[PDB]
Amino acid sequence: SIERLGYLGFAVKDVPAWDHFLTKSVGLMAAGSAGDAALYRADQRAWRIAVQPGELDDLAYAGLEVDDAAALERMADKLRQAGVAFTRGDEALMQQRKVMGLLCLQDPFGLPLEIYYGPAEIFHEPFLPSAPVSGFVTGDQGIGHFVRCVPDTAKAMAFYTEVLGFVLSDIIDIQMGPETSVPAHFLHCNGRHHTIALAAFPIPKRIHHFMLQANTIDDVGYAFDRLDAAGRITSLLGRHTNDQTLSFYADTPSPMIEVEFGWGPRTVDSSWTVARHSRTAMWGHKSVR
Amino acid sequence: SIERLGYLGFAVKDVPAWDHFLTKSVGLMAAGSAGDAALYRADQRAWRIAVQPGELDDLAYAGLEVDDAAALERMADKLRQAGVAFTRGDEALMQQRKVMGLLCLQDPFGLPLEIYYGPAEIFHEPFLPSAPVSGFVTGDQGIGHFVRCVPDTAKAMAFYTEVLGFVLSDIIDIQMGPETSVPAHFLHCNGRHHTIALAAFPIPKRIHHFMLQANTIDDVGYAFDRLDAAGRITSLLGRHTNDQTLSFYADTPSPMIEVEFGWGPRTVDSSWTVARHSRTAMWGHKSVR
Amino acid sequence: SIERLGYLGFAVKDVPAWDHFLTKSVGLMAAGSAGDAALYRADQRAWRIAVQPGELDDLAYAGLEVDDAAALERMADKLRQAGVAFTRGDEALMQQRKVMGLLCLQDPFGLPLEIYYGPAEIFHEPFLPSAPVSGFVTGDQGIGHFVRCVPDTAKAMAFYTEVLGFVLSDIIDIQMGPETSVPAHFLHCNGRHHTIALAAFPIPKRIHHFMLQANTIDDVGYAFDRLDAAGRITSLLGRHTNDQTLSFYADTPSPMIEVEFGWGPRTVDSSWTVARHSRTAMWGHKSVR
Amino acid sequence: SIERLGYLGFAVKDVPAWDHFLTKSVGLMAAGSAGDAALYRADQRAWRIAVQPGELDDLAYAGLEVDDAAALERMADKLRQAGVAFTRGDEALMQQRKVMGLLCLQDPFGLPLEIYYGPAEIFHEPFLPSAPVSGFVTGDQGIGHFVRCVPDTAKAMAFYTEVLGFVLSDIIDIQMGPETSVPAHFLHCNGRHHTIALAAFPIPKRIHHFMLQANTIDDVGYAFDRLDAAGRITSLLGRHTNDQTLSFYADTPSPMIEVEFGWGPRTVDSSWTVARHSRTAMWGHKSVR
Amino acid sequence: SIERLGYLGFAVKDVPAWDHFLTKSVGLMAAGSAGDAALYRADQRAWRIAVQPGELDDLAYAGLEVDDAAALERMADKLRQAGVAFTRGDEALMQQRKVMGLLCLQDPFGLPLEIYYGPAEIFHEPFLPSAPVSGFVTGDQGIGHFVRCVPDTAKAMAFYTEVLGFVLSDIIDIQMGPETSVPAHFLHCNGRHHTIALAAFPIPKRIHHFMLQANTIDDVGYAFDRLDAAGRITSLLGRHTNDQTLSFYADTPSPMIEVEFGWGPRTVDSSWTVARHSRTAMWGHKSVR
Amino acid sequence: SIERLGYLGFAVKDVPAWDHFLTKSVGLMAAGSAGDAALYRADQRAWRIAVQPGELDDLAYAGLEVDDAAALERMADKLRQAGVAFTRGDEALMQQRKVMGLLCLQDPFGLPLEIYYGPAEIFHEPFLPSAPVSGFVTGDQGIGHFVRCVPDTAKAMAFYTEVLGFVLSDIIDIQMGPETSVPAHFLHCNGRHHTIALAAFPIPKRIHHFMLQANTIDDVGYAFDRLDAAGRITSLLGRHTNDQTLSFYADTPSPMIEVEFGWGPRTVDSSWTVARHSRTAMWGHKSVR
Amino acid sequence: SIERLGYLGFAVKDVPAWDHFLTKSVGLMAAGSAGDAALYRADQRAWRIAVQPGELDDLAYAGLEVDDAAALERMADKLRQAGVAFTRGDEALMQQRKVMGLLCLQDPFGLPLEIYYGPAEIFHEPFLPSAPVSGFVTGDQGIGHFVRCVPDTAKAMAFYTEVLGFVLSDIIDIQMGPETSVPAHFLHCNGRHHTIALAAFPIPKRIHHFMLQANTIDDVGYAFDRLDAAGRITSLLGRHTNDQTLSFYADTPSPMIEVEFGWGPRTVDSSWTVARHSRTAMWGHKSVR
Ligand SMILES: [Fe+3]
Ligand SMILES: [Fe+3]
Ligand SMILES: [Fe+3]
Ligand SMILES: [Fe+3]
Ligand SMILES: [Fe+3]
Ligand SMILES: [Fe+3]
Ligand SMILES: [Fe+3]
């Protein structure tokens, strides 16, 4: 029922650092501010990523998008039935997020979520990258995806699939040590292979990384050099086994939070078949961190 | 449930003026008369626009099309259930409109509507424009669209969506003054971004303008010169934020009633997402009136 | 529910004449016999048209095809419920028609119909025309169409649509005299604009004509010369207003029964809209008979 | 060396008749006048066909187009070398024809020809047909073609090919009587199968007919009805053996001068092979005159 | 300079056998006769293959086609210069071959050749196969190809390439025995990989086989069954190493003369590179004879 | 022989103004400096436009590009033969222009030209617009075009065509007053309709305007708003008669020097035909200056 | 005049190492031997790369391919005229290289070259990679390219371009140190951006590296892992500035000789323009050696 991941908000110790990072390195377009949040664009939306000051140095909230007012009410009904606590956003928050309506809640482990509809668009102010990137693949598939760290994967799954409507794409057993592996669960809610992945990682953050998809392979290759020059590279170029995203990872200014910049993944449809993978990389992705 | 806007009828103080306007300027094909109404064609339909003498100088009625006899009966049932008053058209009116069946009613604010099915087509008399226009985009998306002025938008919405079946595409807050803006609601009932838009405008007419879509950009550019020569231009070429219709506006011979001539808008489908815009123009559309 | 018109059987006074006609003029492939019926092919089916001796000089029966055994049983249930009398074909008839199952019945006015499934195909004996025709458009749309003459159109309609599942495409008012016109009703049951049309014609036959669709326009042009040389032409080339079939008509050896040979008609889909036409010809089709 | 047939001028006894004919029947756009010549357009050229008063009731002259000033001078040199008499057009004639330069001459049998370059175009006045025709195929292939009647075909050939540069496409032996046939020679100077054809016909005119090519088959079918209603049809629809032009012929208001309206012919290229045909019609083209 | 192989003439001991073979097995269309030669068509040409009575039971002559009259004269000049004896065909022979002009000669080893231009075409009598074959690939690439047996390959090469203009495509060393192999030389004169191949085979005939190319793979598969039923198969289906023709061979009624029926070979262009192959078959082509 | 217009250099009274103009308004990418010239990029070239301080406020020089070293030498030979004075650029100038070789000269009326080869490209520094423009159409067609003002058009023509190799596309008679018109000559040297146009305009500058071609129509529409906001618009959107460039004009910071921003013009090829036009605008282009 | 690089032969100290390398790492297909040379295939050619024992540990010879026998003779004539010493290969060498003819020579600095024609192909033994690679891009563009180290670039250029016919694509100044850069010259002889590049590198080998082009990007990514596992990687993935080859470099078992494995480069045509680049990498290609 959730249609796609619409936006992301971070609370960070170094806002200027994040600002230079999202613009000069990632290529996002600086789009003013809202309250104490610096806004960044990747397309026609008024904003896609917000950065506000905070000791968390983590993802502060994620906006899950539905297609209309009725859709939002149906979601409220679903939350009620599932016994999930939520608060309807007030005029102030609606004004802040630039949405027509939203329900604020949390997943089983504390990550604030905001189900909303009616996002603001500013076509009269065409997107202009701050670095050389031909553009980002968003649209119906949203802004990108992120891997959510959870203490209990089965519990996170029930909520994301049963309450929010995400559908399992596949699983990848991620080798942690000699005989230690974590089964990462990749979920989709539209054509993007996965919008949210759940994994029991020994990480002190709400997420491992967030991913943005560029239009061309050169976008990625160019982006890799920009981040290598910034000395932020954590992995060499590679392609994933399940979604086939060709990408590289890099450190954001927030310790233990990374960004993935990729291109050309496979998409999901009705006939999608659940499968299991033993490795995350088809090829490449050698760790550099 | 209404499938598309099929026809439009105007009651005007200057019929010869409207006649020269629809033909020499807009390019429509004169198609004889019915009663005291001059008929005009834009394609294979026996008529699409009718012009009759009247002090109103406004839209007299709008024909909403359904795909068959059963569809019309289902609509009657819906009107009954909604408590909406209607009268089945008699042989005379059917003969006049050249339709197989129709229900006559009014929207909440007095605009006569006629739900019909089985329109007449005259393929043996191929459309021939009266001015240089390659053709119009009609077909499944109907004749075009119009913006309906209403005193109460919420009330108009309930009727058009709940009773007639239109679906909200998006909203554009139209700046009226210093701190005055009107939220225009754009509704679709097929692939055309919108067939009817509702807005609380301080206009003494039932509508602000009606829109026709030509096949090429040159059609529009050529049309702009024809209307500029007639001195009717009210806006320069531009493209809208929501549907991306590239067009210009011009005054019809009826004061405060305009026509929009455009090309290449985006179309709507199942996956359409409701959004909000702060401006009507992506670019251009500078007021000239 | 009927999926398409699968076959046609004629009972004629001059079988050799019909044989030379279907082969040398129309181009069908002679395919042996079954009982006292000469069989003719137009594609991979064991037969599409059968010709047997008889004083009728008219269509003897029409095979309406469904996609499987269950489909046929569902149709029997429907006939039962509608009070329509029918007999399940015996081994003998199944053997004769080369089908896996069939129900024999009659429409409201005596035309024998046979609802069947599991037709026989002989791919090991590729279709070979008897005259120069690149091929026929059949497949999912069946063998072609025919216009059924009826005394009561409303009564025929109820049966064909309500009992058999055909859907109205459109209507054409056919001028008969000074102030006499017959509203022909065109029905579809798949992508072919119409498989059966009903009209109250003052003709002493069950049908006016049957139609076959060739692959190219040259097929038709070539066919016209072949039939003109046989002196059978009844109409010049033309294109119809509703389906846009480009064709010509010719007399079969059975008096008052004609054949239509055409190309490139428009096809029907979910979004089809019922409409009315005042003429049968878009252009051409001048009577020659 | 001649690049294409650019224009045609007729001298006729009934100008109003020719005017109604070229516009209401053929669909050409009336384009004012030059001297005592009424001009008609088929596309972006200022004019393509001119009609002036005269007892001839025949083609008065044909404009053969080259691509530039040098090209015209090279042609003058060629005429000089071939001993062909010519006169360079004066300012007056250049003004009249709306060309940048032209050489006036005659073919071996008296038909005035004008080799020119730099034709005038009026894109600011888009072509608008006077009858329903989607458009004409001109461009690099010129306005169309015409069949030139000559007393000596071998003599006409030497001139058109050796002096003017036309290249033989093929020949069609046209049966005249019991044992009388005329070998028509079809010549091209660009992609159009033929721009000029030569034949020893017992006709008292400089040409048999001129041909115009419409964009669609419906254009032709529609045109046939328009001319049949005018009672001018001389041949039924058909397709030619050599160029495969699908067309019909009709009488112009000038006795023994016809017009051919067609669609979809084959085009010529480098690899074209000369061939011989025994008939003019692939199919159709039955004489009606 | 020769443009393509246009026709073939055989002199055979059993004409009725060859007639049933070319029609019922190969699928060619019987096209009457000329003198004592039975003619057969494969497309729009008046004839492509001729069969006349004779003790030879071999290829009697091959028609090499040029694009026009000048081309033929240029070829005569070339023959003169090369000292090759030739005779211009008289009206009688021109009438017999249905060509506009031809030069009769012989290759270095006695095979009569006829260089001609202006072949006759009969589009008013569309090709109609005598057996199920969708059509043949001819056109600019001619009727097909044949392998010419010669006592001296170097001598044959000089003539075919130096005098007639054929260009070497490649060579295939054909294993004859333990340590005996014949280098077959494949020559092209257009896009067809080869129109004539030369090889020093111990065969008492002028040729080994002639080849015809069908439009689809099913054409070939179907043809194989037809000839297997006739018990004429000499090789199983296979694909050649150099041209990639997928085909099978079969015996004609003339002992030691075979026919090849194939599909989908590669074509030749300007950039073609000469190469050498050790086998004739890429796969398949197992001998059955 | 000149292959395309590679670069442009301006000498202006207000460099900061030109800098803000080329970047914020036009969208070019600032690319450092060379000597006292500020460089700007539109694609992969190290620079395309240079701006240096000077009282001229006009085009200082134009770089005409050839494909290699030999090409440049052939051009020197041509200049020698034509008696045109030129100087080979020294290491310093080569270093300044970033080219491998260049010849410096002047056209008949003082505009410095530099024929060069081997331009520098910096793919490792991807083009990044300074304003929202999807990109520019350059490549084989160079950077764009410019209209050169000359006192004697015939004299300018001889030089540009006879010495430099440009080819005339067409002419447009530009109405100056009541009975005063200037015949503008448009020249091409590649697929771009024209790279240089010559016209006898009463302007005190070397050029009237220079033109840049964007990838999309939205690029232009967006650009128009940016320049209108800067209050520099001199013409409304429109499309030209000859090249069909859809564009608008605007004033550069240099008085009487304008810029044209357009999209979608037609391109030129071998078969191009010289023609004459009476107006510059197909539609639109209303003067605003 | 040389058409493409056909083959390469190496003389190496460790043949088994090279064998495992070309097969298990690169993916080439082992194809037996010739004399003391192990042969390897990448496509339909009998062999593309040969490896023989030798102390050189360098490229032993390069086969330059022409399209036919005449072409080879024309090349001999050219060598004679240029005073370049050469020896026609004997039966033995022809047998060894599997070519129909070849001329053996050396470039100005000792690298043996063999101009040949008529290479052997074995389609009956389809290419089968020894490692996972979808295939290689060869065909008309040959096997790949190599960078030739030379002491005098101007001298090497004159020979390769003036004697052998290669054409300069572009130049890249390769930074060697603080103020030391080597101008690498890239030459083409077909569509491949470059087949041979010349550069004054301080390397004790005849070449720096040879390049092979795979069909997909995954081929390269997969290949990179295979060679990284072998610990041979010398550069990370990257894309070149001039040809845009996306690739990585790796060490062959021969010290100071590398291999480049890439995909998707740009191709060259008639309109190619010579240009200069300051870096070899568009992005990536970070040194790892
Ligand atoms: Fe990821
Ligand atoms: Fe509108
Ligand atoms: Fe019909
Ligand atoms: Fe004609
Ligand atoms: Fe063969
Ligand atoms: Fe311009
Ligand atoms: Fe390389």
UniProtKB/Swiss-Prot annotation, chains A, B, C, D, E, F, G:
Residues 4-118, 142-264 form the VOC domain. GO terms for molecular function: biphenyl-2,3-diol 1,2-dioxygenase activity; ferrous iron binding. Its EC number is 1.13.11.39. The keyword Iron applies. PROSITE patterns: EXTRADIOL_DIOXYGENAS (PS00082), VOC (PS51819). InterPro entries: DiOHbiphenyl_dOase, Glyas_Bleomycin-R_OHBP_Dase, Glyas_Fos-R_dOase_dom, VOC, Xdiol_ring_cleave_dOase_1/2. Fe cation binds at H145, H209, E260. It comes from the Bacteria. Its cofactor is Fe(2+). Pathway: Xenobiotic degradation; biphenyl degradation; 2-hydroxy-2,4-pentadienoate and benzoate from biphenyl: step 3/4. It comes from Pseudomonas sp. (strain KKS102). GO terms for biological process: xenobiotic catabolic process. Homooctamer. The lineage of its organism: Bacteria, Pseudomonadati, Pseudomonadota. It catalyses: biphenyl-2,3-diol + O2 = 2-hydroxy-6-oxo-6-phenylhexa-2,4-dienoate + H(+). It is an enzyme of class 1 (oxidoreductase). Keywords: Aromatic hydrocarbons catabolism, Dioxygenase, Iron, Metal-binding, Oxidoreductase, Repeat. Belongs to the extradiol ring-cleavage dioxygenase family. This is Biphenyl-2,3-diol 1,2-dioxygenase.
